[PDB]
Amino acid sequence: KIPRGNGPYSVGCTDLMFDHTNKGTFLRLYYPSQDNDRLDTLWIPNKEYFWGLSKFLGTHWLMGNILRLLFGSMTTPANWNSPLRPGEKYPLVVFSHGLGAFRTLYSAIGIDLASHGFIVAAVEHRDRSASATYYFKDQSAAEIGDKSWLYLRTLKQEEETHIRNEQVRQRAKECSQALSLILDIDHGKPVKNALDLKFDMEQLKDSIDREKIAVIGHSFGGATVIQTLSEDQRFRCGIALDAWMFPLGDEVYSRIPQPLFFINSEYFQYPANIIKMKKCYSPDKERKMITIRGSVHQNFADFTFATGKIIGHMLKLKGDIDSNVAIDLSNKASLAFLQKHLGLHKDFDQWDCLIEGDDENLIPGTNINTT
Ligand SMILES: Cc1ccccc1-c1cc(Nc2nc(CCCO)cs2)ccc1C
Ligand SMILES: [Cl-]
């Protein structure tokens, strides 16, 4: 089980694709919902995601079919296509997934944010960093639902620097484009979803607190946080969850005016990576860093909830820390940081001490020694 959110709001979920092409926006939306009696949301909704995941794990695409047999009916606790909870403007989070991931794999995070009164737009990237993604070749294809699938690209060592950077720059553009789509839907623009889903986008009219915008992301998505902030001042702060800093160009480091929070795992980080995070620091800028004790890179994504403790530890899906314990720390510290830098009038300042790494299961800053 992926945990239910800790906040007071029921959670709805839907998907949005606009336009239908490979240059359009594809996102999974988590939102405060009016109703709580809908079907739960299918976690990995298409066989081709399992094929993609199998390719990313270095197994045969038929191991994909075994993963599909085991996980293909798994849900996540969000009311599928539930009506939006009316009568309130909600702050917006744009969320960026890691390498080998896709839009649906960070629901523990998206559901928790939505339960505290956020709308969350978890983008699916078309940069070939997703395990799989899909789109439609043209209008005819979209209509009949003839999907074109795009699978993860494996790089030669010589391609690494250049292609990771083209990818992080495409990802930032995709974050900005997803922001503009939501803001236009808030500002009442008719949008025909390329997906035929029983969720009317007209509900999102006048629903966004249009200045309370953040960008959050894990791993490759954590670098996407930083690139997005440097290029799009509409994002007011960012939270990088175990950021993988390698994709970033030398230029970006001095170019991030917004508050930025690094939440790291204990076991993923390494000097080269930490050195890059410290390059984002400047005396005029707001920066925070915490490390979750006993945690691994996978503690921020949903696979940490998908198996039991023994298999979980073996597959490096789980750390020494309890997965619910770890995500609560990262989600609660994130809420307090967002309240502070978005100027929210909620009770998220009850977790201010977590921003400073003041908890038995937090390390202030980093455990990693650099020079
Ligand atoms: C547990 C599970 C359920 C359904 C499909 C696959 C798995 C699985 C997943 C991993 N790990 C992965 N990590 C990523 C990147 C995430 C973002 O960093 C993609 S697959 C390892 C082993 C298994 C069986
Ligand atoms: Cl790790």
Q: Parse the chain into domains and list their residue ranges.
A: 1-371
> What resolution does the deposited structure have, in angstroms?
2.0
CA distance 341 to 320: 32
Given phi > 0 = left and psi -120 to 50 = alpha, else beta, which region is 188?
left
Method: X-ray
Q: Which of 303, 304, 311 to mutate to test the pocket of ligand 1 (most atoms within 8 A of CB)?
A: 303
Beta strand pairing status for 11-18 and 75-80?
A: parallel
Helix (H, G, I), strand (E, B) or coil at 210: strand
Q: Which of 53, 59, 66, 129 to mutate to test the pocket of ligand 1 (most atoms within 8 A of CB)?
A: 53
297 among known catalytic residues: yes
Instruction: Answer yes or no: are the C-beta atoms of 241 and 295 closer than 8 Å.
Output: no
Task: Kindly state the greatest CA–CA separation across the chain.
Answer: 58
Instruction: Answer yes or no: are the C-beta atoms of 214 and 236 closer than 8 Å.
Output: yes
Helix (H, G, I), strand (E, B) or coil at 364: strand
Instruction: Answer yes or no: are the C-beta atoms of 4 and 41 closer than 8 Å.
Output: no
Q: What residues sit around ligand 2, an ion, with C-beta below 5 angstroms? A: 267-268, 296-297
Alpha carbon separation from 349 to 88, 90, 92, 291 (Å, rounded):
21, 18, 18, 19
Pick the CATH number of 1-371 from 3.40.50.1820, 3.40.50.300, 3.90.1510.10, 1.10.1200.10: 3.40.50.1820
